[PDB]
Design a protein around this ligand. Structure first.
Ligand SMILES: O=c1[nH]c2cc(CN3CCCC3)ccc2n2cccc12
Length: 350
């Protein structure tokens, strides 16, 4: 039987939950009969990215009907939905394709996830959990509650979480220290890069099997460009409140997972509005999206050189921005070093 700590075994089940994969899909109105998990293929998701990009181009071009209705029918044919005696929604605007594009993203993490699960050895010698664990390629340990680390992380979570978006309260059930296999010699060269910060990265529970196995990736060129604030990259927040919004928890499933990663930001390109960048100005290595709020800078604490902005949220310098909180973006995968994984319970104020 498994020699892992219980909280670790419990985390493994959480991330390899098949039911959660199905619920996440039906919740998207995906027809499970025609498109079951087993029929999920990346090649089919890439094609849908491409059709969605083809709809944005037609939308922005202002095509004469028939063209939008056909491209819309093409997408719904490739990605089987079930809306009953009602035709799917016409993808004729930016809001509409962005929603579909974000859908494909998670659908892909589910496909990646299911591929990992339904793959490997079929023996019965080792207990599944130990097998599933090995599939992640990440060393996972429990962070003691009465540990300075845990205290740091708890303060960061509590401080950067306030009462103006307090439609819920956050309680840390488990903190895990993470080290993905190899994710060391890849980040190290960037470790000689100042402006290293400990930042948040929230994501739905069904996307962790993928993020751990392969780390945080960047969207492919075929993906639609609509919705992105600062181009295709890895998005981080310095306030748990902003990130917590991507865990997609509810009263039914009140438990999510949040990542704390060290990011070698370097000199940041500071912006206040959505820009088409991805290509940095010479001498800059990251983008900072200036939010109206930011943790009180006076309460920053750098660890090992790593900056930890756990200050309580204050009004920032400028609110003439389009963002409510700070956003940090990197366009190189080796600039991130995932350090912690948090399991959190959300208590809704309703
Ligand atoms: O912490 C963050 N997580 C996050 C997650 C998503 C959704 N994933 C993208 C691909 C699959 C699901 C989208 C935007 C963010 N984000 C933006 C600023 C900070 C975060």
């Amino acid at each position: 039987k498994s020699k892992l700590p219980k909280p670790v075994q419990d985390l493994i089940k959480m991330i390899f939950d098949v039911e959660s994969m199905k619920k996440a899909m039906v919740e998207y109105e995906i027809d499970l009969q025609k498109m079951p998990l087993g029929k999920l293929s990346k090649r089919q998701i890439q094609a849908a990215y491409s059709i969605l990009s083809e709809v944005q181009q037609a939308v922005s071009q202002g095509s004469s009907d028939s063209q939008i209705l056909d491209l819309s029918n093409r997408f719904y044919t490739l990605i089987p939905h079930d809306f009953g005696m009602k035709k799917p929604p016409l993808l004729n605007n930016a809001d509409s394709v962005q929603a579909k594009a974000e859908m494909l993203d998670n659908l892909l993490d589910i496909e990646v996830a299911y591929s990992l699960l339904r793959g490997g050895s079929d023996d019965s010698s080792k207990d599944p959990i130990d097998v599933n664990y090995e599939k992640l390629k990440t060393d996972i340990k429990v962070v003691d509650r009465d540990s300075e680390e845990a205290e740091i992380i708890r303060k960061y979570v509590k401080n950067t979480h306030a009462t103006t978006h307090n439609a819920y309260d956050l309680e840390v059930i488990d903190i895990f220290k993470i080290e993905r296999e190899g994710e060391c010699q890849r980040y190290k060269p960037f470790k000689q890069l100042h402006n290293r910060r400990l930042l948040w990265h929230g994501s739905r529970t069904t996307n962790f099997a993928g993020i751990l196995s392969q780390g945080l990736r960047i969207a492919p060129p075929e993906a639609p460009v609509t919705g992105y604030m600062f181009g295709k990259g890895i998005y981080f927040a310095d306030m748990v409140s902003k990130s917590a919004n991507y865990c997609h928890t509810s009263q039914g499933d009140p438990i999510g997972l949040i990542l704390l990663g060290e990011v070698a930001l370097g000199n940041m390109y500071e912006l206040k509005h959505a820009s088409h960048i991805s290509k940095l100005p010479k001498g800059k290595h990251s983008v900072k999206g200036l939010g109206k709020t930011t943790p009180d800078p006076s309460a920053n604490i750098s660890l090992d050189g790593v900056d930890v902005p756990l200050g309580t949220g204050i009004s920032s310098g400028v609110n003439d921005t389009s963002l409510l909180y700070n956003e940090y973006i990197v366009y190189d995968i080796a600039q991130v070093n995932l350090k912690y994984l948090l399991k959190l319970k959300f208590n809704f104020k309703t």
